[PDB]
């Protein structure tokens, strides 16, 4: 029983701390849209009008109440901010809409170790799912005028058939929409408290056009000249999730009860936050995640189909019987078809865009070195031995805070567990 003399692959020590919390620019699994189908009102397309139209699809509003106060914050300024936006909408015709720079607005508009907590893995599982709606390929259909090899467009087009209804795709489209509206407002007003509706559009299970309202953002002042100059903002986001079941996830938020829906109470997650022309541009460019994940899908498919000396694309996507380990359940490791693979590799790329951080950039470069070293131990019956740097020390040092980074560690631990069991 002296394994204790041997150095072999242990898992990574994650940090002790109060449970990690949510920190993305907007809500993910917890989001709630009010929407309109076939929208055709006068001025459709125009955010503020579309928004007013989504707000009128709902009749359950009640008198706002704080229900999970932010504990750094002056909570009643967040009620007054909601109430203010509610008030300022009940009106008569213009395109955009600045808020009375009231007292509670002006206020609202201006390491510690934490441990892993389950909500993040649950968010990840939701991101990989199919939705009833599709989030790309929404226009009238036409030729692919665009010069691209046969097999490469076959792969691209198969992938799209698998990711177009993926929930991670809604998140890309949501970041694109919101960030680009934010850039627009930040540059037109600059001295204005513009009310910025959080929108996406999609097409439904039946094929209808649909426009969605997740909530609203108010911009602070936006005289920005460095790319790094910061726009404060307050985001207010509808949700049906009762923040009291997992109050640790909501530490950054004041949460209000604002209504009932068909029957559950309805919540508004509120928090202040900040961005810059560079972060907004990052959001605006979240379709790169479709690219990134296609390329890894394509090279998985290359590698395999070279072994078998035929193109396997068609057979992988259609028969759905080649599979790949990609998840775990109470029975051990589970394999899925190429379509779950595309959606999951999508979601990983989207999350690590939603949670970009230096801790991620470190963890992911160092852990790759260990990865290759553990696959070499695994794949070679006389593998030899390997020098770690302070590989463990370089990796483990990235594990401070970050919910996303900390799952990735947990996920890597799982792997080590199985790679060598």
């Amino acid at each position: 029983i002296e394994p204790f003399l041997k150095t072999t692959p242990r898992p990574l020590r994650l940090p002790n701390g109060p449970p990690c919390s949510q920190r993305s620019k907007f809500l993910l699994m917890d989001a709630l849209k009010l929407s309109i189908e076939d929208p055709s009102h006068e001025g459709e397309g125009i955010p503020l009008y579309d928004a007013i139209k989504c707000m009128r699809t709902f009749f359950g509003w009640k008198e706002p109440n704080v229900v999970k106060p932010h504990e750094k914050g002056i909570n009643p300024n967040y009620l007054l901010s909601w109430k203010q936006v509610l008030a300022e909408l009940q009106d008569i015709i213009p395109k955009t809409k600045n808020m009375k720079k009231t007292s509670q607005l002006k206020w609202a508009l201006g390491p510690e170790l934490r441990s892993l907590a389950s909500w993040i893995q649950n968010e990840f599982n939701k991101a990989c799912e199919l939705t009833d709606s599709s989030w790309i390929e929404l226009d009238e259909i036409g030729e692919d005028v665009a010069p691209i090899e046969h097999i490469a467009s076959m792969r691209r087009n198969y992938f799209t058939s698998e990711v177009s209804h993926c929930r991670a795709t809604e998140y890309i489209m949501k970041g694109v929409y919101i960030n680009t509206a934010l850039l627009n407002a930040s540059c037109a007003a600059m001295d204005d408290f513009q009310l910025i509706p959080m929108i996406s559009k999609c097409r439904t299970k039946e094929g209808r056009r649909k426009t969605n309202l997740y909530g609203f953002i108010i911009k602070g002042r936006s005289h920005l000249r460095n790319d790094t100059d910061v726009v404060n903002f307050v985001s207010m986001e509808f949700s049906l999730t009762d923040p009291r079941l997992e109050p640790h996830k909501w530490e950054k938020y004041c949460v209000l009860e604002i209504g009932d829906m068909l029957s559950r109470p309805m919540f508004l997650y509120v928090r202040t936050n900040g961005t810059s022309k560079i972060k907004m541009k990052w959001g605006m460019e979240m379709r790169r995640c479709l690219l990134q994940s296609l390329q890894q899908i394509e090279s998985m498919i290359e590698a395999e189909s070279s072994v078998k000396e035929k193109d396997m694309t068609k057979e992988f996507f259609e028969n759905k019987s080649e599979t790949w380990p990609i998840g775990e359940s109470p029975k051990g490791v589970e394999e899925s078809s190429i379509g779950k693979v595309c959606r999951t590799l999508l979601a990983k790329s989207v999350f690590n865009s939603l949670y970009a951080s230096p801790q991620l950039e470190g963890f992911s470069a160092e852990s790759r070195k260990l990865l290759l070293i553990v696959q070499a131990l695994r794949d070679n019956l006389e593998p030899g031995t390997f020098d770690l740097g302070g590989l463990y020390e370089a990796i483990e040092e990235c594990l401070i805070n970050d919910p996303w980074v900390l799952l990735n560690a947990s996920w890597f631990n799982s792997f080590l567990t199985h790679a060598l069991s």
Partner: peptide, 15 residues
């Protein structure tokens, strides 16, 4: 299932 995409590497040689 809990989805864990680093479990791919039980099968896919890190490209």
């Amino acid at each position: 299932m809990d989805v864990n995409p680093t479990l791919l590497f039980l099968k896919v040689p890190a490209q």
